[PDB]
Write a protein that binds this ligand. Structure first.
Ligand SMILES: O=C([C@H]1CCN(Cc2ccccc2)C[C@@H]1c1ccccc1)N1CCC(O)(Cn2cnc3ccccc3c2=O)CC1
Length: 324
């Protein structure tokens, strides 16, 4: 394969799956490597530790470990990971990093890669008041239950809600009202993170192992409020985060370079796999998170990274950390 795996400290759950997804977002990786953490405390800097993992994943020939990272952002209590969603963890990481890039030549890489804009709206049926609020997003959560595939989930996401009695809308000057709330997409990011809502509550939270489908390629101009002839919103499955069981095991399937050559990443064991094993076979063992990249940004996002693309201070500081 060439590619190298992560150690198990146990209970990390989705952490190892997320870390590889980030590592193989090549334009992220370079920018992480270009952050200025010369004079930072090794043991409680998130950005520093993210560089270690990234650097090791690039070079190490043995299973890489993550012990110091877990330490840096302080999830050590017996429930930390069980009690959170992937989107949460991600946010913890890319947050710290967005903030470390401020000032530098790579400032605002994260928003450039993962951020898009949304339009929430409420419209009154017989009366004239509309409320429009714009919103940035860095990920989106999709409805599964009673949905066959992605396309319905989007259709559902943009479905117009109604506001009848018992749930009538307070318009202030015009009192209670029958109204329609919806959501609509202004723009979709180069790198599209989608979470599948599989963990839901009942007489007591539970996992829905129901069959959900996703394609290799995903056109979203349908859902754009206004399209563009030159950059249309088609997307290429890069990553597929998988859980199996209940109480189980968390694996990720990637095609790092983008070419449709797949690999199963199970902690320390990375092995080549079929496309069927990464897509259909995880329709429902099944997927909870999906990563798509936009065809027009594929080459930039997944730009190649040399061993020279790491700075020297960085490299040296790490070498010495290993020695002792
Ligand atoms: O890793 C988990 C697990 C938490 C822990 N449980 C049991 C468990 C496993 C391992 C050790 C101890 C106990 C199993 C969870 C699980 C559920 C379903 C699919 C896979 C794993 N999760 C939570 C769900 C997830 O965040 C996906 N997502 C995102 N956003 C949502 C927004 C709104 C509504 C639902 C969701 C939702 O389900 C993935 C990470």
């Amino acid at each position: 394969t060439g590619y190298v795996g992560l150690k198990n400290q146990g209970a990390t759950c989705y952490m190892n799956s997320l870390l590889q997804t980030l590592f193989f977002t090549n334009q992220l990786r370079k920018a992480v490597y270009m952050m200025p953490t010369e004079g930072d405390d090794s043991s409680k800097s998130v950005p520093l530790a993210l560089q270690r993992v990234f650097y090791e994943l690039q070079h190490s020939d043995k299973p890489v470990g993550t012990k110091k990272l877990t330490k840096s952002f302080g999830w050590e209590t017996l429930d930390s990971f069980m009690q959170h969603d992937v989107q949460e963890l991600c946010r913890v990481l890319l947050d710290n990093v967005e903030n470390k890039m401020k000032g530098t030549c790579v400032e605002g890489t994260i928003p450039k890669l993962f951020r898009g804009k949304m339009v929430s709206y409420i419209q009154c049926k017989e009366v004239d008041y509309r409320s429009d609020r714009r919103e940035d997003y860095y990920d989106i959560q999709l409805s599964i239950k009673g949905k066959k595939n992605i396309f319905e989930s989007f259709v559902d996401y943009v479905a117009v809600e109604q506001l009848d009695g018992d749930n009538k809308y307070d318009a202030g000057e015009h009192g209670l009202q029958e109204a329609e709330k919806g959501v609509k997409f202004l723009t979709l990011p180069p790198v599209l993170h989608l979470q599948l809502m599989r963990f839901m509550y009942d007489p007591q939270n539970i996992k829905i192992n129901d069959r959900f489908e996703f394609p290799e390629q995903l056109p979203l101009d349908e859902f754009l409020q206004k399209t563009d002839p030159k950059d249309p919103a088609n997307y290429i499955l890069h990553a597929v985060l998988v859980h199996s069981g209940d109480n189980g095991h968390y694996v990720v399937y990637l095609n790092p370079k983008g070419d449709g050559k797949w690999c199963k990443f199970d902690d320390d064991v990375v092995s080549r796999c079929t496309k069927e094993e990464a897509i259909e076979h995880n329709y429902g063992t099944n997927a909870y998170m999906l990563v798509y990249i936009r065809e027009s940004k594929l080459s930039e996002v997944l730009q190649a990274v040399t061993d020279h693309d790491i700075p020297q201070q960085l490299v040296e500081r790490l070498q010495e950390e290993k020695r002792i």
